[PDB]
Amino acid sequence: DFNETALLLAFKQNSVKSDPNNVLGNWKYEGSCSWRGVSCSDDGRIVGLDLRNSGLTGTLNLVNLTALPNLQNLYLQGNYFSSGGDSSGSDCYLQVLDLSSNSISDYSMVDYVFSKCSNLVSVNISNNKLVGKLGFAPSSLQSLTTVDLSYNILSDKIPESFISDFPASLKYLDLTHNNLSGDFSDLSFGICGNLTFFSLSQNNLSGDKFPITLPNCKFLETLNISRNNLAGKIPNGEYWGSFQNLKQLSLAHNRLSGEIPPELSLLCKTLVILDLSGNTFSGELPSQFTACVWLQNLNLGNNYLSGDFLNTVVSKITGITYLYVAYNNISGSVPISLTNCSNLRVLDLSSNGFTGNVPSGFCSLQSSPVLEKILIANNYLSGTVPMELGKCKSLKTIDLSFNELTGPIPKEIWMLPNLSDLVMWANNLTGTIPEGVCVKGGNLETLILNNNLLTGSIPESISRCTNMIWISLSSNRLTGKIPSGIGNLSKLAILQLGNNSLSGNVPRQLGNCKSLIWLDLNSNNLTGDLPGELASQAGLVMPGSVSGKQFAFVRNEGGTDCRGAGGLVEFEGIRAERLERLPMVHSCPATRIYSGMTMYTFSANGSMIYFDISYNAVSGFIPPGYGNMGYLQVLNLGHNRITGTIPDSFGGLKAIGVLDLSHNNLQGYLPGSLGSLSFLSDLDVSNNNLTGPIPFGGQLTTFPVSRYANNSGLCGVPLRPCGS
Numbered sequence: 001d002f003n004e005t006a007l008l009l010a011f012k013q014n015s016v017k018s019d020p021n022n023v024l025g026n027w028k029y030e031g032s033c034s035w036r037g038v039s040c041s042d043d044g045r046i047v048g049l050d051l052r053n054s055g056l057t058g059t060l061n062l063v064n065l066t067a068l069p070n071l072q073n074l075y076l077q078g079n080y081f082s083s084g085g086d087s088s089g090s091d092c093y094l095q096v097l098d099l100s101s102n103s104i105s106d107y108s109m110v111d112y113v114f115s116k117c118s119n120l121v122s123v124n125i126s127n128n129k130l131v132g133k134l135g136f137a138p139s140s141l142q143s144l145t146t147v148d149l150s151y152n153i154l155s156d157k158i159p160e161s162f163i164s165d166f167p168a169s170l171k172y173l174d175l176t177h178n179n180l181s182g183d184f185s186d187l188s189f190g191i192c193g194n195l196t197f198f199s200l201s202q203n204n205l206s207g208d209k210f211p212i213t214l215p216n217c218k219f220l221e222t223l224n225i226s227r228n229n230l231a232g233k234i235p236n237g238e239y240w241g242s243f244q245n246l247k248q249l250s251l252a253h254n255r256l257s258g259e260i261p262p263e264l265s266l267l268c269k270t271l272v273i274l275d276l277s278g279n280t281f282s283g284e285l286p287s288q289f290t291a292c293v294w295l296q297n298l299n300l301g302n303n304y305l306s307g308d309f310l311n312t313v314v315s316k317i318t319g320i321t322y323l324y325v326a327y328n329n330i331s332g333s334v335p336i337s338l339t340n341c342s343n344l345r346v347l348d349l350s351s352n353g354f355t356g357n358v359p360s361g362f363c364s365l366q367s368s369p370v371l372e373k374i375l376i377a378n379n380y381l382s383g384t385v386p387m388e389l390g391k392c393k394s395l396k397t398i399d400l401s402f403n404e405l406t407g408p409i410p411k412e413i414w415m416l417p418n419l420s421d422l423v424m425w426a427n428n429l430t431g432t433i434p435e436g437v438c439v440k441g442g443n444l445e446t447l448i449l450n451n452n453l454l455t456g457s458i459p460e461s462i463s464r465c466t467n468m469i470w471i472s473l474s475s476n477r478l479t480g481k482i483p484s485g486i487g488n489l490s491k492l493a494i495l496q497l498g499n500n501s502l503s504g505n506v507p508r509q510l511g512n513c514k515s516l517i518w519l520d521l522n523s524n525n526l527t528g529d530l531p532g533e534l535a536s537q538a539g540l541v542m543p544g545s546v547s548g549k550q551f552a553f554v555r556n557e558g559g560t561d562c563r564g565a566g567g568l569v570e571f572e573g574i575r576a577e578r579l580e581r582l583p584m585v586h587s588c589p590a591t592r593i594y595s596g597m598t599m600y601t602f603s604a605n606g607s608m609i610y611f612d613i614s615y616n617a618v619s620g621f622i623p624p625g626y627g628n629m630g631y632l633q634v635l636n637l638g639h640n641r642i643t644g645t646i647p648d649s650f651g652g653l654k655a656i657g658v659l660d661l662s663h664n665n666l667q668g669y670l671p672g673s674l675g676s677l678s679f680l681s682d683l684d685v686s687n688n689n690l691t692g693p694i695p696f697g698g699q700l701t702t703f704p705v706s707r708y709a710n711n712s713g714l715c716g717v718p719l720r721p722c723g724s
């Protein structure tokens, strides 16, 4: 062990606790320049060490490597290194340093880098565990272009002079996703001659005012302060006047208020991306923004904006690709001028005050239709769905949910070749679902039509919808049998057919749907027996692609009148307040409304979560296999003709919160096994032929007497004791 070689051997024996891949297997005494990751300069001294993405675990002490006299390049990123260089130490020759994507927590290490390493061009410490507060700036490092401290735990405030004390050479500074706090207005930027990238996004910065010296950075290309606590208004006057190159601006998701200042339009000579989303802004996008000819992506969503600016302003920017205006106060008709934007890929008008017709001109001169998504949900739109929409061959998503729409759905929409999501719920739509579905048009992921006037049958053709994830037809006029072909949909997760006229028997082929976690058949005309095959995926179910979708679930204190009211709905682009215009809301006031992204309740080997067949004519016995569903939280079989006994197997319903067997023909004893269900919070066994002792264990003695009423001689607490 001699000199540099000794140093590296020290690292392998000391810094590295495990090398499962044997990447260091050739670091072995007797010349170190042939070692894996080691690169040498002509003197034969190590000029670099590249261990990236090697699966190494250990305690990094940076000074232990940087003692290497000639080392200019160090890549340890994408490993398990923790702790870090810390200490203080020898001379540092580093030019490039990448420590990202490790476990490093010791800010002392960054202090060492900012102090000693005077030839440093770039430092990436991002995606680590660094805790503590920012120290002195690296004023002595005069080649330093690039510093990425993002995705750490850094806290307290950015020191007032921190940024102004950086060397003149600084191009890129990223503080994104830390714990930083304090007044944004207290930062000084100094001369700021080279800085083209600055991001504070996802922190705790606050205050009433923008920093006076930020406008010093005349060359800033992207300025991102999004997802902070900034309050007050967007600075007007000359504040934006000196930015020469500003391309990406994001003020999004802050507390900012007032109108959007006309002076902001000074940025229009450059701006290609503007995100003002998620603030309190009112008024209009100023007319000066017609100069915004290079603007590609405009996000004004989630404010109080109103007026005609989409017409007078945004119509005029011919190259706009993405337009997000949802959750605002805009009224009037959707401007038809909007259809002059021939590069528009996404148009989100959801949750505004729009009246009048859906735009019929969206792909005219073609050349050729580029539009992917049109979202107008939760407005006041009237008339029908224009057949012209059938012209945009590129449509991936149409969302017209919760408008005043009427008439049938033109065949042309069902023949859109790329259609993925057709989401039209809470309208007055009529007609039928065509036999050509998913054959003569796109192979759909979701079809959400609940709470319309649709009639006829679910077409046997729905079986070719093999991409299908989520089907909601509830509360329509549908008749006929549930087609056995639905069993061909191996990704189907949620099927809601409730409150229709469906009849015949539930096809046993439903049990062949490998992904089904949610089945609501309630309030139909169904007869026949509960197929045993409905439980055949129990234990096998894998969490699928229905995750990550906006939903709402409306809970009510009812009750028998309240069935069919509330429950689970697709929530994209809709405000909770519009939910109160759903049917039966007077009888069934929402007691609680859950909302969010959909997430599965199991990592793997799951079952059905939710099964409601109540209010049908179903007969036969309960299949004992149903008791094998370990993740089932709702089983509602009430108001049917079901006979036989309650299966002892129901003891394996370990997740069940709601079990409604009421108003059937059940007989025999309640299974003592029911006492072992620890989450059972709602049990209704009433109006059957049941007899004998009410199990004494678990929750059974905690229920109101009404849950046991009208049976054949049940006894024991809460009823009269069995030893009468």
Ligand SMILES: *[C@@H]1O[C@H](CO)[C@@H](O[C@@H]2O[C@H](CO)[C@@H](O[C@@H]3O[C@H](CO[C@H]4O[C@H](CO)[C@@H](O)[C@H](O[C@H]5O[C@H](CO)[C@@H](O)[C@H](O)[C@@H]5O[C@H]5O[C@H](CO)[C@@H](O)[C@H](O)[C@@H]5O)[C@@H]4O)[C@@H](O)[C@H](O)[C@@H]3O)[C@H](O)[C@H]2NC(C)=O)[C@H](O)[C@H]1NC(C)=O
Pocket (backbone or CB within 6 Å): 176, 201, 202, 222, 224, 225, 226, 227, 248, 249, 250, 252, 253, 273, 274, 275, 277, 278, 297, 298, 299, 301, 324
């Ligand atoms: C300023 O800095 C932030 C990072 O802190 C950058 O924001 C990130 O943008 C990326 C790229 O677009 C997003 O990743 C994509 O996310 C989508 C799904 O995203 C949804 O879910 C996440 C999770 O909660 C959410 O954060 C996203 O939020 C965006 O969209 C809102 C509008 O709906 C908007 O109000 C919000 O500001 C944010 O805006 C960005 O996206 C919209 C695109 O719709 C764009 O208009 C705008 O300019 C911003 O880019 C959203 O609800 C996945 O499908 C993708 O595959 C991909 O993962 C990040 O989610 C996003 N925000 C974060 C991380 O907080 C900005 O781009 C940056 N601006 C500039 C110019 O540098």
Ligand SMILES: CC(C)[C@H](C)[C@@H](O)[C@H](O)[C@@H](C)[C@H]1CC[C@H]2[C@@H]3COC(=O)[C@H]4C[C@H](O)[C@H](O)C[C@]4(C)[C@H]3CC[C@]12C
Pocket (backbone or CB within 6 Å): 494, 518, 551, 553, 555, 594, 597, 598, 599, 600, 601, 609, 633, 634, 656, 657, 658, 681
């Ligand atoms: C897996 C998805 C389909 C779903 C949207 C998912 O994201 C979501 O977390 C589901 C599981 C939740 C959201 C609301 C939940 C219900 C909340 O409201 C209901 O009143 C309760 C009553 C009672 O507490 C029961 O335990 C079940 C039950 C009825 C819950 C069962 C599971 C949910 C249905």
Ligand SMILES: *[C@@H]1O[C@H](CO)[C@@H](O[C@@H]2O[C@H](CO)[C@@H](O)[C@H](O)[C@H]2NC(C)=O)[C@H](O)[C@H]1NC(C)=O
Pocket (backbone or CB within 6 Å): 100, 101, 124, 126, 127, 146, 148, 172
């Ligand atoms: C600093 O390194 C991080 C890597 O951890 C870089 O972030 C990655 O960038 C790539 C390519 O842009 C993304 O696709 C990766 O997903 C990112 N990974 C993570 C975990 O975010 C970052 O690019 C580097 N910073 C600089 C300035 O180069």
Ligand SMILES: *[C@@H]1O[C@H](CO)[C@@H](O[C@@H]2O[C@H](CO)[C@@H](O)[C@H](O)[C@H]2NC(C)=O)[C@H](O)[C@H]1NC(C)=O
Pocket (backbone or CB within 6 Å): 168, 169, 170, 191, 192, 193, 194
């Ligand atoms: C941006 O950084 C560069 C360094 O890359 C700075 O350039 C130095 O500027 C001085 C003064 O003009 C020159 O004498 C040096 O020769 C430059 N160094 C190099 C390596 O070119 C530049 O000043 C910085 N920008 C500003 C405006 O501060």
Ligand SMILES: *[C@@H]1O[C@H](CO)[C@@H](O[C@@H]2O[C@H](CO)[C@@H](O)[C@H](O)[C@H]2NC(C)=O)[C@H](O)[C@H]1NC(C)=O
Pocket (backbone or CB within 6 Å): 499, 500, 501, 522, 523, 524, 525, 615, 616
């Ligand atoms: C077909 O299905 C519906 C839904 O289950 C049945 O009826 C409803 O009947 C109950 C009891 O009378 C009422 O409380 C609901 O309000 C009714 N809803 C509607 C929209 O009608 C209906 O009886 C069945 N029809 C046949 C052929 O018997």
Ligand SMILES: *[C@@H]1O[C@H](CO)[C@@H](O)[C@H](O)[C@H]1NC(C)=O
Pocket (backbone or CB within 6 Å): 304, 328, 329, 575
């Ligand atoms: C904008 O719409 C919201 C509905 O979410 C409403 O409360 C508000 O009054 C409207 N305009 C205002 C006053 O900001």
Ligand SMILES: *[C@@H]1O[C@H](CO)[C@@H](O)[C@H](O)[C@H]1NC(C)=O
Pocket (backbone or CB within 6 Å): 475, 476, 477, 499, 500, 563, 564, 565, 566, 583, 584
């Ligand atoms: C159930 O369906 C009938 C007929 O479609 C309708 O009048 C009613 O609004 C629906 N009820 C609920 C709770 O959605």
